[PDB]
Design a protein around this ligand. Structure first.
Ligand SMILES: Cc1cc2nc3c(=O)[nH]c(=O)nc-3n(C[C@H](O)[C@H](O)[C@H](O)COP(=O)(O)O)c2cc1C
Ligand SMILES: Cc1cc2nc3c(=O)[nH]c(=O)nc-3n(C[C@H](O)[C@H](O)[C@H](O)COP(=O)(O)O)c2cc1C
Ligand SMILES: O=C(O)c1[nH]c(=O)[nH]c(=O)c1CCc1ccc(C(F)(F)F)cc1
Ligand SMILES: O=C(O)c1[nH]c(=O)[nH]c(=O)c1CCc1ccc(C(F)(F)F)cc1
Lengths: 313, 313
């Protein structure tokens, strides 16, 4: 019994990969994820120019999860594109490149350059919609008219299948709106649910202080805090976008957690906080654990149970 | 050392109270909460007519928290108004009455009849905005125009200081907008942050099933999942609403959790999931624990540290 699957015209050894932003910023990080047992890897979301990001400390982790306000530190698009075009070994596993430009224009400029590399090498685009918006407005994926613009502009500029990284939603009307926006765009072939749960605040009781320096301590939450939010978003979009794939992200620490994402509808399962904490060895553990749950249940394939969460009456 | 507070022209022995919905639906519940060592109590969010609520199971709890889709089961406004006007022993502690009408008109009708009882007996109104409006639209506090309409109508109808129960927000632009709406209304004297984190999804791995029956298993999350979200909201409104009080709700299981709420800006601290799971004995434990942390730190009163969370550099 093995976990290999085929999606998006690519073959994957297993459904696991890193979450964007974790273990994927530098050449060393990408080589490390390539050497791991993960089924795929995704690069750090990039901007046109390099960024240093926010002042440290900017990430912290705890038993129940993590908080971050990294500020998009990255080596710049030219680097990630060169990695995709010249350095990545596609014989080892597929590559996703994540883009999060500061404007629609920036994204368009980056995607027009990525398109020939996608055609030649098969690198897959993940568009991070947790990105800056015009004054007074929330992040792009929380402004549905902005989202529709970005997707229209990217779809025209890129012209190839791509995916989108989504923040979580918390309201059924929002799920309905957001999924309807996505379903306007046939080139959006996968939706990754979810990014960090925004603008949480961790305070340390002893020091009476927040634990990260940017944004007066506020930052995105990941890890065990967010699993039920992640599962709800996965399933909500799985239900609403039958012609798309859903990739799950959030709160995966075990094969059981992966199993729950798959039951909710996930095709690929991304690992952020737990990977940052445990390191790339986590992928062998996750695979073993998931195969063990499958074996106990009599499942031979992922397709036997993907999306098959049961409801009551 | 002491936990006393004086606010809203009332005196409280300590900051602890139930969260609306928990241990507060029936007369038996309200007598229990009154007999407890909590500083105050709040009644179940009510509607004009009695409601049976959603089918069971509609609440479940687990090590990290709870999920619920109760559907507003309650005895009807006339019951809670009678409790306020004739049954509650105000010599024991203050009472809040929570309302959650299904339209603006329904809320107006209730607060019109609550006013004279508020003025004569000193019951305090908590208006639940994290609540259904037109189906297919977001909850009221996720629809800023609706929120403003509700607040204008209830302020005119009621004419006395009240407070509002808010859902969590996740985007800084939302914190800004939401606070700006609340700050239009001088009668809104307290803001309780937060109601449950909406539409999460808990799945049980063994049975491969969701754990609550309504809404295909989607429901609001409470407990350990939501403490950093709760803290963020408390602090965000604390900073943005300097002429109002903030009451904290979410993730309180210990005196330490309560101390973090208070550092964030909380005046009263409400207990939902943990009170549901432990029972009213939790209030003596929380009091003891909070007093122990105060003694270790040399704090004599709550004002010495309320809102005094430190930021980094
Ligand atoms: C340190 C850090 C940096 C991240 N940077 C990005 C990023 O560049 N792009 C992105 O799409 N998400 C980013 N995320 C969000 C993660 O991809 C993931 O959505 C989130 O952490 C939830 O998954 P988890 O519960 O496994 O951590 C970052 C997360 C962390 C912890
Ligand atoms: C069973 C149950 C019923 C609830 N009913 C209400 C309600 O009627 N009104 C309301 O404002 N909040 C209601 N809530 C939300 C809680 O008041 C509280 O905001 C939320 O549970 C988070 O706090 P916690 O982490 O301590 O559970 C309910 C929560 C639970 C668990
Ligand atoms: O780098 C981060 O802080 C981060 N952390 C997350 O948990 N999720 C993310 O998606 C991100 C990146 C968010 C982001 C995207 C784009 C900009 C920019 F255009 F200004 F560079 C900034 C931050
Ligand atoms: O009665 C509840 O379900 C409830 N639960 C909460 O966690 N917070 C609340 O404020 C409420 C009352 C408002 C309300 C009513 C109906 C629903 C539902 F139909 F989606 F279950 C949710 C929230």
């Amino acid at each position: 019994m093995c976990l290999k699957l085929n999606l998006l015209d690519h073959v994957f050894a297993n459904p696991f990969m890193n979450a964007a932003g974790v273990l994927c910023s530098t050449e060393e990080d990408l080589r490390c994820m390539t050497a791991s047992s993960s089924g795929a890897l995704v690069s750090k979301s990039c901007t046109s120019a390099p960024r240093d990001g926010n002042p440290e400390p900017r990430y912290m982790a705890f038993p129940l999860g993590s908080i971050n306000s990294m500020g998009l530190p990255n080596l710049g698009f030219d680097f990630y594109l060169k990695y995709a075009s010249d350095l990545h070994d596609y014989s080892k596993k597929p590559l996703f490149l994540s883009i999060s430009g500061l404007s629609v224009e920036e994204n368009v400029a980056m995607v027009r350059r990525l398109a020939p590399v996608a055609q030649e090498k098969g690198v897959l685009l993940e568009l991070n919609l947790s990105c800056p918006n015009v004054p007074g407005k929330p992040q792009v994926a929380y402004d549905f008219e902005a989202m529709r613009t970005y997707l229209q502009q990217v779809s025209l500029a890129y012209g190839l299948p791509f995916g989108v990284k989504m923040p979580p939603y918390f309201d059924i009307a929002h799920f309905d709106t957001a999924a309807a926006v996505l379903n306007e765009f046939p080139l959006v072939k996968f939706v990754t649910c979810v990014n960090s749960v925004g603008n949480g605040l961790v305070i340390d009781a002893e020091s009476e202080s927040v634990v990260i320096k940017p944004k007066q301590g506020f930052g995105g939450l990941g890890g065990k805090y967010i699993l039920p939010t992640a599962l709800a978003n996965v399933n909500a979009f799985y239900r609403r976008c039958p012609d798309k794939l859903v990739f799950g992200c959030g709160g995966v620490y075990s094969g059981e957690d992966a199993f729950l994402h798959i039951l909710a509808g996930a095709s690929m399962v991304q690992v952020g906080t737990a990977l940052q904490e445990e390191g790339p060895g986590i992928f062998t553990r996750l695979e073993d654990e998931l195969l063990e749950i499958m074996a106990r249940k009599g499942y031979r394939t992922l397709e036997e149970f993907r999306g098959r969460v049961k409801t009551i009456e």
